[PDB]
């Protein structure tokens, strides 16, 4: 039989709106990531979606057909059980420009990524570029480019686009990134994509000597309505472990924590709690490691976790020393152009007193520029940000024409 383990690697699925990301994830895993009513109604990804699958290989069969997502080699004639390779999971990003920030949060959780371009659309589009550049900046460079919807066009049209993609990636970090043509909707050439995932998105080395840190993107509760108000199950916090590992019954804290109001005034206090359960999808475990999206059950009052209240938080061991900053210094670099914009546009230099948006881990925060130099800015934050390490990248956005657009990036200096 195949073992029941947690996913050991996270793969982002990103790209311009409507190019078929969620359908691609479904073609691979059998799962439709959209769980919210607004998503189903509007036919769009809004919150980060998630899906897992085992990956295995039929050792006596021919590739790529030998790659399977279930323990059966029948499809290639063998009666032998396929060799289990690993369990993987997908972080399904929204393509809509207005949801760029969400993509950025998701990118903090990715070990690698798939960029979806549509074969029946002109390359390249605004969020094709924006997501590409974001991936580069954040360091998600184990990339596969998927040419989706090939069922819609002839082979020569798809090839013409392929040439365009090669031209675009040339002279960049992605020059040798593979391009794999599929039909997500009708499930064509999906096995070449599995093969490509095994070849180009290896499970990263996980440094065990690192303190446990989890980035939070979800929070909620498994409390069915009508449940007795003093028999309620504790709050659940969802996210991804980016370093170290967590274990059931560990004492943890949520940083910055909860918003405290004294009269008018607003401060933040760390939320201390204990891990009551660890869950990956539908399976329970005794420990949680990087790779996958984990649901950490706690003893917290459900009202503290309801409706993704803790999005952007981090979780650490109770006694970890973690700076929670209302002011930050960033060693920065601006893009030449606002890549996410429909019309070509130059990036204006940072100006004192202007409001910027900062993506740090899974958090998104507005701040006012208090100092500008050539290589560094200092920012006064509207809400504090937990900074768990010395080498954390931030992505910098500016509001242009009422739209938050990525304009640069930097290192948060402590
Ligand atoms: N012909 C064809 N249509 C496809 C293919 N993949 C997806 N589509 C269609 O494109 C539309 C959008 O699919 P969806 O998977 O929601 O794309 P998405 O990129 O996740 C949308 P969002 O960016 O808002 O998250 C759907 O009508 C879907 O059936 C394909 O391989 N071929
Ligand atoms: Mg989608
Ligand atoms: Na599967
Ligand atoms: Na301050």
From Swiss-Prot:
<dbReference type="InterPro" id="IPR022424">
    <property type="entry name" value="TIF2_gsu"/>
</dbReference>
<feature type="binding site">
    <location>
        <begin position="148"/>
        <end position="151"/>
    </location>
    <ligand>
        <name>GTP</name>
    </ligand>
</feature>
<feature type="binding site">
    <location>
        <position position="76"/>
    </location>
    <ligand>
        <name>Zn(2+)</name>
    </ligand>
</feature>
<dbReference type="InterPro" id="IPR044127">
    <property type="entry name" value="eIF2g_dom_2"/>
</dbReference>
<dbReference type="Pfam" id="PF00009">
    <property type="entry name" value="GTP_EFTU"/>
</dbReference>
<dbReference type="GO" id="GO:0005525">
    <property type="term" value="F:GTP binding"/>
</dbReference>
<comment type="similarity">
    <text>Belongs to the TRAFAC class translation factor GTPase superfamily. Classic translation factor GTPase family. EIF2G subfamily.</text>
</comment>
<dbReference type="InterPro" id="IPR000795">
    <property type="entry name" value="T_Tr_GTP-bd_dom"/>
</dbReference>
<dbReference type="Pfam" id="PF09173">
    <property type="entry name" value="eIF2_C"/>
</dbReference>
<keyword id="KW-0342">GTP-binding</keyword>
<dbReference type="GO" id="GO:0003924">
    <property type="term" value="F:GTPase activity"/>
</dbReference>
<dbReference type="InterPro" id="IPR050543">
    <property type="entry name" value="eIF2G"/>
</dbReference>
<feature type="region of interest" description="G4">
    <location>
        <begin position="148"/>
        <end position="151"/>
    </location>
</feature>
<keyword id="KW-0547">Nucleotide-binding</keyword>
<feature type="binding site">
    <location>
        <position position="45"/>
    </location>
    <ligand>
        <name>Mg(2+) 1</name>
    </ligand>
</feature>
<keyword id="KW-0648">Protein biosynthesis</keyword>
<keyword id="KW-0396">Initiation factor</keyword>
<feature type="binding site">
    <location>
        <position position="58"/>
    </location>
    <ligand>
        <name>Zn(2+)</name>
    </ligand>
</feature>
<feature type="domain" description="tr-type G">
    <location>
        <begin position="6"/>
        <end position="205"/>
    </location>
</feature>
<comment type="subunit">
    <text>Heterotrimer composed of an alpha, a beta and a gamma chain.</text>
</comment>
<dbReference type="GO" id="GO:0003743">
    <property type="term" value="F:translation initiation factor activity"/>
</dbReference>
<keyword id="KW-0460">Magnesium</keyword>
<keyword id="KW-0378">Hydrolase</keyword>
<feature type="binding site">
    <location>
        <position position="22"/>
    </location>
    <ligand>
        <name>Mg(2+) 1</name>
    </ligand>
</feature>
<feature type="region of interest" description="G3">
    <location>
        <begin position="92"/>
        <end position="95"/>
    </location>
</feature>
<feature type="binding site">
    <location>
        <begin position="18"/>
        <end position="23"/>
    </location>
    <ligand>
        <name>GTP</name>
    </ligand>
</feature>
<feature type="binding site">
    <location>
        <position position="18"/>
    </location>
    <ligand>
        <name>Mg(2+) 2</name>
    </ligand>
</feature>
<dbReference type="GO" id="GO:0000049">
    <property type="term" value="F:tRNA binding"/>
</dbReference>
<dbReference type="GO" id="GO:0046872">
    <property type="term" value="F:metal ion binding"/>
</dbReference>
<feature type="binding site">
    <location>
        <begin position="183"/>
        <end position="185"/>
    </location>
    <ligand>
        <name>GTP</name>
    </ligand>
</feature>
<keyword id="KW-0862">Zinc</keyword>
<comment type="function">
    <text>eIF-2 functions in the early steps of protein synthesis by forming a ternary complex with GTP and initiator tRNA.</text>
</comment>
<feature type="binding site">
    <location>
        <position position="43"/>
    </location>
    <ligand>
        <name>Mg(2+) 2</name>
    </ligand>
</feature>
<keyword id="KW-0479">Metal-binding</keyword>
<feature type="binding site">
    <location>
        <position position="73"/>
    </location>
    <ligand>
        <name>Zn(2+)</name>
    </ligand>
</feature>
<feature type="region of interest" description="G1">
    <location>
        <begin position="15"/>
        <end position="22"/>
    </location>
</feature>
<dbReference type="InterPro" id="IPR027417">
    <property type="entry name" value="P-loop_NTPase"/>
</dbReference>
<feature type="region of interest" description="G2">
    <location>
        <begin position="43"/>
        <end position="47"/>
    </location>
</feature>
<protein>
    <recommendedName>
        <fullName>Translation initiation factor 2 subunit gamma</fullName>
        <ecNumber>3.6.5.3</ecNumber>
    </recommendedName>
</protein>
<dbReference type="GO" id="GO:0001731">
    <property type="term" value="P:formation of translation preinitiation complex"/>
</dbReference>
<dbReference type="InterPro" id="IPR009000">
    <property type="entry name" value="Transl_B-barrel_sf"/>
</dbReference>
<dbReference type="InterPro" id="IPR015256">
    <property type="entry name" value="eIF2g_C"/>
</dbReference>
């Amino acid at each position: 039989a195949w073992p029941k383990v947690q996913p050991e690697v996270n793969i982002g699925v990103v790209g311009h709106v409507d190019f078929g990301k969620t359908t691609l994830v479904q073609a691979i895993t059998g799962i439709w990531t959209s769980k919210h009513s607004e998503e189903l109604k509007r036919g769009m990804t809004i919150k980060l979606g998630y899906a897992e699958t085992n990956i295995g290989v039929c050792e006596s069969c021919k590739k790529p057909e030998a790659y399977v997502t279930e323990p059966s080699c029948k499809s290639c004639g063998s009666d032998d059980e396929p060799k289990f390779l690993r369990r993987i999971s997908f972080i399904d990003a929204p393509g809509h420009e207005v949801l760029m920030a969400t993509m950025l949060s998701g990118a903090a959780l990715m070990d690698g990524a798939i960029l979806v371009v549509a074969a029946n659309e002109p390359f390249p589009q605004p969020q094709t570029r924006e997501h590409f550049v974001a991936l580069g900046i954040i360091g998600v460079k184990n990339l596969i480019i998927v040419q989706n919807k090939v069922d819609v066009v002839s082979k020569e049209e798809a090839l013409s686009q392929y040439r365009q993609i090669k031209q675009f990636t040339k002279g960049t970090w992605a020059e040798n990134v593979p391009i794999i043509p599929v039909s997500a909707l009708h499930k064509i050439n999906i096995d070449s994509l599995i093969e490509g995932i095994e070849e180009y998105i290896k499970t990263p080395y996980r440094d065990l000597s690192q303190k446990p840190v989890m980035l939070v993107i979800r929070s909620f509760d498994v409390n069915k309505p009508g449940t007795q108000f003093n028999e309620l199950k504790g709050g659940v916090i969802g996210g991804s472990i980016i370093q170290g590992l967590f274990k059931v019954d560990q004492e943890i804290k949520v940083l910055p924590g909860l918003r405290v109001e004294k009269q008018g005034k607003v401060s933040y206090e760390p939320i201390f709690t204990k891990i009551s359960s660890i869950r990956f999808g539908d399976e329970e475990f005794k420990e949680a490691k990087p790779g996958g999206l984990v649901a950490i059950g706690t003893y917290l009052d459900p009202s503290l976790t309801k409706a993704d209240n803790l999005l952007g938080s981090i979780i650490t061991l109770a006694d970890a020393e973690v700076p929670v900053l209302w002011n930050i210094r960033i060693k920065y670099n601006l893009l030449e152009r606002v890549v996410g914009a429909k019309e070509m546009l130059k990036v204006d230099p940072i100006r004192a007193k202007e409001t910027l948006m900062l993506s740090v881990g899974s958090s998104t925060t507005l701040g006012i520029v208090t100092s500008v130099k050539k290589d560094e800015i200092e920012v006064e934050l509207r809400r504090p940000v937990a900074v768990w390490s010395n080498n954390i990248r931030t992505v910098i956005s500016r509001q242009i024409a009422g739209r938050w657009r990525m304009i640069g990036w930097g290192l948060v200096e402590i």
